[PDB]
mmCIF file of C-alpha atoms in Angstrom:
data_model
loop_
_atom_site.group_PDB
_atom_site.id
_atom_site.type_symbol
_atom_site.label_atom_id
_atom_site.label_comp_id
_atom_site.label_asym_id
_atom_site.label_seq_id
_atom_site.Cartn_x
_atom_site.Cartn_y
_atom_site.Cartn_z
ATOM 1 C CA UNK A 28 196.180 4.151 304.021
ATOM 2 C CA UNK A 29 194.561 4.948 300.482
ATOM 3 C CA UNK A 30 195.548 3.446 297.079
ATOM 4 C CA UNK A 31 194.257 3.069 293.831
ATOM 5 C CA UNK A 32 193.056 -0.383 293.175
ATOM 6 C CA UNK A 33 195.249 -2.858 291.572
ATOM 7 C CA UNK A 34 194.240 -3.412 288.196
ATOM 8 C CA UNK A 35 194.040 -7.195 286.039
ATOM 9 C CA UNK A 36 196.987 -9.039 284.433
ATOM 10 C CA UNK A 37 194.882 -8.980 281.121
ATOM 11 C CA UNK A 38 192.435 -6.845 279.395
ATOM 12 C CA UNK A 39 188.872 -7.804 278.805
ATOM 13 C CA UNK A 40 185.843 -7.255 277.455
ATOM 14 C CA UNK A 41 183.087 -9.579 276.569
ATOM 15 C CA UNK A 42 184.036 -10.952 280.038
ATOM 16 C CA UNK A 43 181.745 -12.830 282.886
ATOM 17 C CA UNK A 44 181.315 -11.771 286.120
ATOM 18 C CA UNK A 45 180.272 -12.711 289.399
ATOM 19 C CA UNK A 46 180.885 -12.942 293.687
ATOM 20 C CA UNK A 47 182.118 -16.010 294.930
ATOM 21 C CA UNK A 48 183.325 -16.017 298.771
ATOM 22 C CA UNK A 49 183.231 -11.923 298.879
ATOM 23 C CA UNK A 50 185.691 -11.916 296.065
ATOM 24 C CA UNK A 51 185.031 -10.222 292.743
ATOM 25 C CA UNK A 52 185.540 -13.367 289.628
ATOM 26 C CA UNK A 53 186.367 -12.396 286.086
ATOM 27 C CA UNK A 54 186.458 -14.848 283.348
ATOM 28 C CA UNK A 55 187.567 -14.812 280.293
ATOM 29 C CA UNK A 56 186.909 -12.354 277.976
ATOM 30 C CA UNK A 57 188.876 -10.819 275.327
ATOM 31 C CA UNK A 58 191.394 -7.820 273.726
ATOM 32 C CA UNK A 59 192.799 -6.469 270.991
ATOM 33 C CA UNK A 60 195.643 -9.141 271.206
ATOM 34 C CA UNK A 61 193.950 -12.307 271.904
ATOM 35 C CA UNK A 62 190.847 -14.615 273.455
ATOM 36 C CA UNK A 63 190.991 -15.248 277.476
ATOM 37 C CA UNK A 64 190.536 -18.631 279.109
ATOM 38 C CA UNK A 65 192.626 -17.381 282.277
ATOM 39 C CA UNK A 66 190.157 -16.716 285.535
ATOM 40 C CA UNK A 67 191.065 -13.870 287.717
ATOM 41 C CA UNK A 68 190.037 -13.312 291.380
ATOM 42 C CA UNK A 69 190.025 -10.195 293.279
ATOM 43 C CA UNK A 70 190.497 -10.111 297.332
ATOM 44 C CA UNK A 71 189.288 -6.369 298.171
ATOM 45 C CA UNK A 72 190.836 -6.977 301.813
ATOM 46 C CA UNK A 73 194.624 -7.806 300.487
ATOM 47 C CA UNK A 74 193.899 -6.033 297.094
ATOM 48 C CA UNK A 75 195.314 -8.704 295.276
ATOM 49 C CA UNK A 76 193.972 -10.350 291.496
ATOM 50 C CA UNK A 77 194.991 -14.113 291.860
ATOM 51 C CA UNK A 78 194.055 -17.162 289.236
ATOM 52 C CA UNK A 79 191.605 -19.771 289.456
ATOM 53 C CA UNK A 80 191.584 -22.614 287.501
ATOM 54 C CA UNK A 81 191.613 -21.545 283.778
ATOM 55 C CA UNK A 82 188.444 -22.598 281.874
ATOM 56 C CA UNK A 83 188.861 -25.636 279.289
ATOM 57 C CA UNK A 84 188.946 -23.357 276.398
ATOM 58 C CA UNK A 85 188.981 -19.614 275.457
ATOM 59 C CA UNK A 86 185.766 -18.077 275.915
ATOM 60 C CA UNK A 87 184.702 -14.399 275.112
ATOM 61 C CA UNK A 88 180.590 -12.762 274.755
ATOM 62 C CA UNK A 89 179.607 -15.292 277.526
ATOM 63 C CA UNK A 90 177.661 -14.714 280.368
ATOM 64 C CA UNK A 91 178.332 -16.410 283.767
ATOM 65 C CA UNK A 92 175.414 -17.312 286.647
ATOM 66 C CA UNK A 93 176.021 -18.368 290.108
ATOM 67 C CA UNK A 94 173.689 -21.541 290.471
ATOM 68 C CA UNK A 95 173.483 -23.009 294.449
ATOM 69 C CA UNK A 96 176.859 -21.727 294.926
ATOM 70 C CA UNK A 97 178.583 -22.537 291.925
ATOM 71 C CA UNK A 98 179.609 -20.914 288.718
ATOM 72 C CA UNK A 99 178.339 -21.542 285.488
ATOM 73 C CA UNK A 100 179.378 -20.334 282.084
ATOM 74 C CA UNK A 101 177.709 -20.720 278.783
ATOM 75 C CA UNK A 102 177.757 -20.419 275.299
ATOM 76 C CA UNK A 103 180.814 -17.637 274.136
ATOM 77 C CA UNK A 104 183.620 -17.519 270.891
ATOM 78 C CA UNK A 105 187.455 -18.290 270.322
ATOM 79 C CA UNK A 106 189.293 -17.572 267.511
ATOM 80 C CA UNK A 107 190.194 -21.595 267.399
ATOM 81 C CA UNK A 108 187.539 -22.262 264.499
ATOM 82 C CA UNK A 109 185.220 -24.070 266.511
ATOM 83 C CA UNK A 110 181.779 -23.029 267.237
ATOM 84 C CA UNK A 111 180.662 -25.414 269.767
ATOM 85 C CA UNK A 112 181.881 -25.252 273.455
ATOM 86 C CA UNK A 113 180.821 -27.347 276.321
ATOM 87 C CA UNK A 114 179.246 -25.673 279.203
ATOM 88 C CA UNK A 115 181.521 -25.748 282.379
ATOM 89 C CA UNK A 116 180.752 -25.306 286.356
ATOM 90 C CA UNK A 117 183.126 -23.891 288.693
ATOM 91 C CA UNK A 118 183.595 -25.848 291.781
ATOM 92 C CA UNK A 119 184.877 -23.740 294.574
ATOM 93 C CA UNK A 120 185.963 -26.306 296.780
ATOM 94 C CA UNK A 121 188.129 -27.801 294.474
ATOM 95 C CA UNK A 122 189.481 -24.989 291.850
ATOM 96 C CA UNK A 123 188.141 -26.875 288.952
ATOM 97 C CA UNK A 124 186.092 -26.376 286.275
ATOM 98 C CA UNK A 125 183.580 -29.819 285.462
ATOM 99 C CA UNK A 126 182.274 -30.239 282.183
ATOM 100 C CA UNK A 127 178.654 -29.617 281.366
ATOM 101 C CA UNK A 128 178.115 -31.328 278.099
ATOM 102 C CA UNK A 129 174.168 -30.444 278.096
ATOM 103 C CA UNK A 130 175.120 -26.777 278.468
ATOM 104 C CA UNK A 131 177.745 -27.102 274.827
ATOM 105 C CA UNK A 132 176.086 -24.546 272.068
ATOM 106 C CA UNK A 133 177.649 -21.673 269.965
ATOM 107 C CA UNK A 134 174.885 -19.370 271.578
ATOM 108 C CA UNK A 135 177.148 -15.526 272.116
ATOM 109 C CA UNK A 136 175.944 -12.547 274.002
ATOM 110 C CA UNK A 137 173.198 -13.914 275.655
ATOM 111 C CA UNK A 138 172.222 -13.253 279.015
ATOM 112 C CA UNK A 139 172.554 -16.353 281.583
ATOM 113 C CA UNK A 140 170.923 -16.309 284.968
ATOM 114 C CA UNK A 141 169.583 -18.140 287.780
ATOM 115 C CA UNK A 142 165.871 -18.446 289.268
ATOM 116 C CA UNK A 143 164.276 -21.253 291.380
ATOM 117 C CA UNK A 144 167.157 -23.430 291.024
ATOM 118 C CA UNK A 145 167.388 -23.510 287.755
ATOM 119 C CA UNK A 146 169.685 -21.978 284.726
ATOM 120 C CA UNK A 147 167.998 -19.269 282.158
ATOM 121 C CA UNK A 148 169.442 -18.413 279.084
ATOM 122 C CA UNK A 149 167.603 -15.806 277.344
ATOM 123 C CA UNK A 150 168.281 -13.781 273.709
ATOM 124 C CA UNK A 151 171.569 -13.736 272.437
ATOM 125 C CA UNK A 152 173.112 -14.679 269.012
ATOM 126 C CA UNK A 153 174.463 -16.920 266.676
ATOM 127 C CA UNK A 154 178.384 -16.468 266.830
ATOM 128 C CA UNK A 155 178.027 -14.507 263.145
ATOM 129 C CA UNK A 156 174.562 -12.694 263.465
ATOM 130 C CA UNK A 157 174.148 -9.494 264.441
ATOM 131 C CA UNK A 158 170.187 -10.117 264.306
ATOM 132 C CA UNK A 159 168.891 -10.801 268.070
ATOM 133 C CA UNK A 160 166.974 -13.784 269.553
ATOM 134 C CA UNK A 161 163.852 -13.886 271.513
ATOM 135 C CA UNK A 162 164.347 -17.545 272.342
ATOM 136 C CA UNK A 163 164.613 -18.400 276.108
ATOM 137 C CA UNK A 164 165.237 -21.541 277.458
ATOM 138 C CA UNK A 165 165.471 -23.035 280.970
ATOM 139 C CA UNK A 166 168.260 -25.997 282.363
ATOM 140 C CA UNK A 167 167.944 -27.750 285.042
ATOM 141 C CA UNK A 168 171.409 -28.957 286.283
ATOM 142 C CA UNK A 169 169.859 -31.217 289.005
ATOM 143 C CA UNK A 170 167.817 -33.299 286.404
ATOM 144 C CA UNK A 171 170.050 -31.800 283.566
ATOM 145 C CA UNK A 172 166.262 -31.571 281.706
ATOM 146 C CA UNK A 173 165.774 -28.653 279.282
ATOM 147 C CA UNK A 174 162.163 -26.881 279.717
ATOM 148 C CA UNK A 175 160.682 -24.545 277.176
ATOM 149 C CA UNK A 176 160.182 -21.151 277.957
ATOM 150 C CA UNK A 177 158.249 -18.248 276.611
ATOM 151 C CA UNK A 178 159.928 -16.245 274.294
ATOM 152 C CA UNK A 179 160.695 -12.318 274.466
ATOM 153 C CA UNK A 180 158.520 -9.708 273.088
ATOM 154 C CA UNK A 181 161.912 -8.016 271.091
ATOM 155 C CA UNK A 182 164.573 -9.835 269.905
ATOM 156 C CA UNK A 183 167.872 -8.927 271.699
ATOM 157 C CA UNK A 184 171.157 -9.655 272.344
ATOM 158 C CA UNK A 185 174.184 -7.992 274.823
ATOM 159 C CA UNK A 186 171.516 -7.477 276.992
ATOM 160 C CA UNK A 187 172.090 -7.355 281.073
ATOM 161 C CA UNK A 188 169.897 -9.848 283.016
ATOM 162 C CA UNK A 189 169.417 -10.145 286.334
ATOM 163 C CA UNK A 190 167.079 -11.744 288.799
ATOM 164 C CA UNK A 191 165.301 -9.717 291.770
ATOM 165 C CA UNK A 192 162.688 -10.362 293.802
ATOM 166 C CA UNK A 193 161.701 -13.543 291.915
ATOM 167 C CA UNK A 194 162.113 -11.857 288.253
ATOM 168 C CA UNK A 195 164.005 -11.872 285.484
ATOM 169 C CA UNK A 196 164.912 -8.829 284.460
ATOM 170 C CA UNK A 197 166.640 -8.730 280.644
ATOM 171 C CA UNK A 198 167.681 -5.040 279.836
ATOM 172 C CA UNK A 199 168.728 -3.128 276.644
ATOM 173 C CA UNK A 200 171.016 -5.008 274.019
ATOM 174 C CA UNK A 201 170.413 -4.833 270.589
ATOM 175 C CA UNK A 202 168.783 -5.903 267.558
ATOM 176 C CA UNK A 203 170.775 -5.575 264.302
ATOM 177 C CA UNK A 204 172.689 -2.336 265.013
ATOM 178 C CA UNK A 205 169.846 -0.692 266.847
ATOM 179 C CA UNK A 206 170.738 0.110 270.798
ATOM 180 C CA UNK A 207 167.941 -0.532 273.221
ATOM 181 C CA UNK A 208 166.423 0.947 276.326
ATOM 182 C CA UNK A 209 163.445 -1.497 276.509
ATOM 183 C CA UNK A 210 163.258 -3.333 279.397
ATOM 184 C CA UNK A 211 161.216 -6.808 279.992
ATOM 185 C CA UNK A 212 160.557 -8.328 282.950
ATOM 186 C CA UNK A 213 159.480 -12.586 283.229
ATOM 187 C CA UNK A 214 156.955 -13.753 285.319
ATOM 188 C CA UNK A 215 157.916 -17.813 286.230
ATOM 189 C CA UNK A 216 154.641 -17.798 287.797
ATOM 190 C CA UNK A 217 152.563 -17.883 284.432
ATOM 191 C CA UNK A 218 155.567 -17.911 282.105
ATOM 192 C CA UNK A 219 155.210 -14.263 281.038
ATOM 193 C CA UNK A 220 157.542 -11.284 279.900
ATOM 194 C CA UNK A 221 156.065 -8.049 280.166
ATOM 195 C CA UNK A 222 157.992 -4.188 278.858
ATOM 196 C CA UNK A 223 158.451 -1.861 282.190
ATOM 197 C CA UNK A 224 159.771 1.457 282.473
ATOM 198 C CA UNK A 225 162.252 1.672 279.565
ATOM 199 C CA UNK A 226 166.480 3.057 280.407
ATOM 200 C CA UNK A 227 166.962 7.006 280.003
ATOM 201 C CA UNK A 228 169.556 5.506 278.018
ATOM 202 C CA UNK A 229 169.500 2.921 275.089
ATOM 203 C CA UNK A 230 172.192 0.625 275.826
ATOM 204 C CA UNK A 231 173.789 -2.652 274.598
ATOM 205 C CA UNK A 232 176.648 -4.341 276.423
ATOM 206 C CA UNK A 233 175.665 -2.491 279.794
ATOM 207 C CA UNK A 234 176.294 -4.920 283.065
ATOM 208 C CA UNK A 235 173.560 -5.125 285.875
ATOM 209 C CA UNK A 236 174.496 -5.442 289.858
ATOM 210 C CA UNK A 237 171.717 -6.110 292.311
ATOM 211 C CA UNK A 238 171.886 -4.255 295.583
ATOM 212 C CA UNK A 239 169.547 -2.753 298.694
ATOM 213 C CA UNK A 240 166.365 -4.324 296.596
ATOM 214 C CA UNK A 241 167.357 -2.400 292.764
ATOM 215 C CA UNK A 242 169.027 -2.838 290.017
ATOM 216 C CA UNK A 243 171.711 -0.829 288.648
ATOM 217 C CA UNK A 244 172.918 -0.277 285.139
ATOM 218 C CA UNK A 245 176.102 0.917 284.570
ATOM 219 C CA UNK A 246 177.946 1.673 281.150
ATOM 220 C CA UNK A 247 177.213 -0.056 277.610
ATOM 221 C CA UNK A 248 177.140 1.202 274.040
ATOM 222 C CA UNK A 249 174.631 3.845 273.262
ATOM 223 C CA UNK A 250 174.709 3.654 269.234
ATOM 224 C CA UNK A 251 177.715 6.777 269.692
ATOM 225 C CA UNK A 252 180.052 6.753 272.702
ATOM 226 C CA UNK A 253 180.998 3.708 275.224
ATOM 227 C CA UNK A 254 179.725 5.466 278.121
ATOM 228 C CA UNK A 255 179.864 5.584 281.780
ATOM 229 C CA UNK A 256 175.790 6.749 282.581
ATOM 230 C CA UNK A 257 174.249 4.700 285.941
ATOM 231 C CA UNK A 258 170.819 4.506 286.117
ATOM 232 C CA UNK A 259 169.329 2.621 288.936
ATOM 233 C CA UNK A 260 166.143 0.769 288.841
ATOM 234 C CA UNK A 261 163.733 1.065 292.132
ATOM 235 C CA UNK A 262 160.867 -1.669 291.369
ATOM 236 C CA UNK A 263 158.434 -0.145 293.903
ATOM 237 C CA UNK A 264 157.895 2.868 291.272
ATOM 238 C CA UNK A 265 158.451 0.917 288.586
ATOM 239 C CA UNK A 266 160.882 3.796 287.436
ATOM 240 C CA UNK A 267 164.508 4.819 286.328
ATOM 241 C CA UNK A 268 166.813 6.984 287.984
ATOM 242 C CA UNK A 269 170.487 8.478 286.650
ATOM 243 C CA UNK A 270 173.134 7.929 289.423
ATOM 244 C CA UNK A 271 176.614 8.733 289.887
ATOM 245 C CA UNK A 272 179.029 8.117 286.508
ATOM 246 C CA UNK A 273 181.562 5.414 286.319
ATOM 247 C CA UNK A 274 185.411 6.862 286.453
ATOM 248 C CA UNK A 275 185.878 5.512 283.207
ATOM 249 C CA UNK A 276 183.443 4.379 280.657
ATOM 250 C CA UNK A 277 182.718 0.846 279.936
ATOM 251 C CA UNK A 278 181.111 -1.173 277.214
ATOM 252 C CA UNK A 279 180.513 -4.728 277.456
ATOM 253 C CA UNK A 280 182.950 -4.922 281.155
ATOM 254 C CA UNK A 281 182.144 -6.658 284.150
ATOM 255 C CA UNK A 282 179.927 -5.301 286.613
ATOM 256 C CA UNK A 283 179.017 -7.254 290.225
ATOM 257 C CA UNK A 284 177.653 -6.923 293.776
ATOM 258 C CA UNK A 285 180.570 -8.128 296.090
ATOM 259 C CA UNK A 286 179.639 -7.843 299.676
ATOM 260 C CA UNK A 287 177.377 -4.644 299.281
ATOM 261 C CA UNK A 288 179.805 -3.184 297.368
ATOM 262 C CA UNK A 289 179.062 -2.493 293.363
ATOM 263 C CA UNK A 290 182.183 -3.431 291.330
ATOM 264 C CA UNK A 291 183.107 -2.497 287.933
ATOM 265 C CA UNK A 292 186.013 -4.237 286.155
ATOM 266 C CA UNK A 293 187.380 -4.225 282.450
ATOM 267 C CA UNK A 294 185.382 -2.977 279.352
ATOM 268 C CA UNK A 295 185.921 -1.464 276.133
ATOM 269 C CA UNK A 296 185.813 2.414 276.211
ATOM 270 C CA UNK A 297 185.962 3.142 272.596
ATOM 271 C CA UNK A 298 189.486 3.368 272.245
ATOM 272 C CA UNK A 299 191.097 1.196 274.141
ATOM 273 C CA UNK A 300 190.352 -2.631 276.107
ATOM 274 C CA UNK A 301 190.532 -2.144 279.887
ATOM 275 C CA UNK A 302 191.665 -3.653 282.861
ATOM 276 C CA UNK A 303 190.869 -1.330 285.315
ATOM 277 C CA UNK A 304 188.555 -1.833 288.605
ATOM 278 C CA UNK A 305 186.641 0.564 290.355
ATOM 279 C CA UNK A 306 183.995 0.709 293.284
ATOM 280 C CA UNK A 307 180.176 2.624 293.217
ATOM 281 C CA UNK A 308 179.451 4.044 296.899
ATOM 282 C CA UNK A 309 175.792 4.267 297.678
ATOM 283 C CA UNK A 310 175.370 6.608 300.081
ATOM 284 C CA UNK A 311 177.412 9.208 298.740
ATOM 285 C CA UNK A 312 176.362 7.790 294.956
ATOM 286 C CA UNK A 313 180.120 8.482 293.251
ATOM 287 C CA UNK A 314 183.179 5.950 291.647
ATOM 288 C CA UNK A 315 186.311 5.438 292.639
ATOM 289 C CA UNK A 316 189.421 3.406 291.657
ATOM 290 C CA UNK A 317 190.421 4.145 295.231
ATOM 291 C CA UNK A 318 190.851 1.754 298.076
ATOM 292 C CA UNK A 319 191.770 2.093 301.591
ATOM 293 C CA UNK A 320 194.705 -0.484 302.643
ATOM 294 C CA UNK A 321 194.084 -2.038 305.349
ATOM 295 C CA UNK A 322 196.867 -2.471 307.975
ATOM 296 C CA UNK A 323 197.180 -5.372 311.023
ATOM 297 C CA UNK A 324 200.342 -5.323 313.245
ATOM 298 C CA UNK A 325 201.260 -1.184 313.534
ATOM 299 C CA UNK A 326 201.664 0.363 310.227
ATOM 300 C CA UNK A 327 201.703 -3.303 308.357
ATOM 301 C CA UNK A 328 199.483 -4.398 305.233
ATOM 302 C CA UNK A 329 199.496 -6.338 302.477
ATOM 303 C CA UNK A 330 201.648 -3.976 299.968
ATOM 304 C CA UNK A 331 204.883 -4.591 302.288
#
């Protein structure tokens, strides 16, 4: 009747996220061991991980954006010597990842999201800096045309992005070694980013899920601990609010809306590289690794 959830095959951090057909994705990433191109998919009605089609090559501190339905997933590092990677899109349909040559750069931890039909990749890194980017840049994979875009106020990278209401929304990372809890917000309308409310908490590495009209913020690197702090974002107020803490916490993991459902999956939590899973509830505003199995002929599920 109750369980804890089943964790990944593999560990990872660095990894990309996303819902695709109310299942939680997680690509890539990487471990103490070794770089990920392997794609796992969790069902949260069978409570199963399964694979996808592996991505060409290993990829770790990516980020992933669902474009029109599909998965996309640029920039990222191997440990095969080879700084460029081409850009690849996920088609459901067919479990198979298509090349996207236009998308190929060495670009790492920036954040990658969609708006308007179209692909933004904003701050970031080259694969050896630790100095941030402000640059932001806009693909459209209809007319595969880049665009220029305006650049941020404060160089960043690790940052979460996310898009809401017709924003972007790029929150904490880093420049240098210095943690953030600025926040910017991009206007497509006139091509403007403007600082909101700042985080409670300076954070690189956090991951963003959108749900009920906010954003929420859960784990990252605070300059001293990998933590497991939640702080939603209501943009009505235009202010921050500490929620419920993570079971575990999590630096540079996977976090995702699946249904309306937050999800949390992987990380780094100072000592160790995770592969653990666990759900936010929003009414009651607390974590679990718990799941309730569900049964379908008598006392039948999908454990056996």
């Amino acid at each position: 009747i109750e369980k804890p959830m089943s964790p990944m095959q593999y560990a990872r951090s660095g990894l990309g996220t996303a819902e695709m057909n109310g299942k939680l994705i997680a690509a890539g990433g990487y471990n103490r061991e070794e770089c990920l191109r392997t794609v796992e998919c969790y069902n949260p009605h069978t409570d199963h991980w399964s694979f996808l089609a592996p991505m060409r090559t290993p990829r770790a501190r990516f980020q992933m954006a669902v474009l029109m339905g599909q998965l996309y997933v640029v920039g990222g590092s191997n440990g095969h010597s080879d700084d460029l990677s081409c850009g690849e899109m996920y088609d459901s349909n067919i479990d198979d990842w298509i090349p996207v040559p236009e998308l190929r750069t060495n670009r790492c931890n920036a954040g990658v999201c969609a708006l308007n039909g179209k692909l933004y990749i904003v701050g970031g890194s080259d694969p050896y800096g630790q100095k941030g980017l402000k640059n932001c840049d806009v693909f459209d994979p209809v007319t595969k045309l880049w665009t220029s875009c305006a650049p941020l106020n404060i160089r960043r990278h690790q940052s979460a992005v996310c898009e809401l209401g017709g924003y972007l929304y790029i929150i904490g990372g880093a420049e240098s070694w210095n943690c953030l809890n600025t926040v910017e917000r991009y206007n497509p309308e006139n091509n403007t980013w403007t600082l909101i409310a700042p985080m409670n908490v300076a954070r690189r590495g956090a991951g963003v899920a959108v749900l009920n009209g906010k954003l929420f913020v859960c784990g990252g690197f605070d300059g001293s601990h990998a933590i497991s702090c939640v702080e939603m974002y209501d943009p009505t107020r235009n202010e921050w609010k500490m929620m419920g803490n993570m079971t575990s916490p999590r630096s540079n993991a996977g976090i995702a809306t699946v249904g309306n459902t937050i999800y949390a999956v992987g990380g780094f939590d100072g000592n160790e590289f995770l592969n653990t899973v666990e759900v936010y509830n929003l009414e009651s505003n607390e974590w679990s690794p718990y799941t309730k199995i569900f049964q379908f002929l008598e006392h039948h599920h999908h454990h056996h």
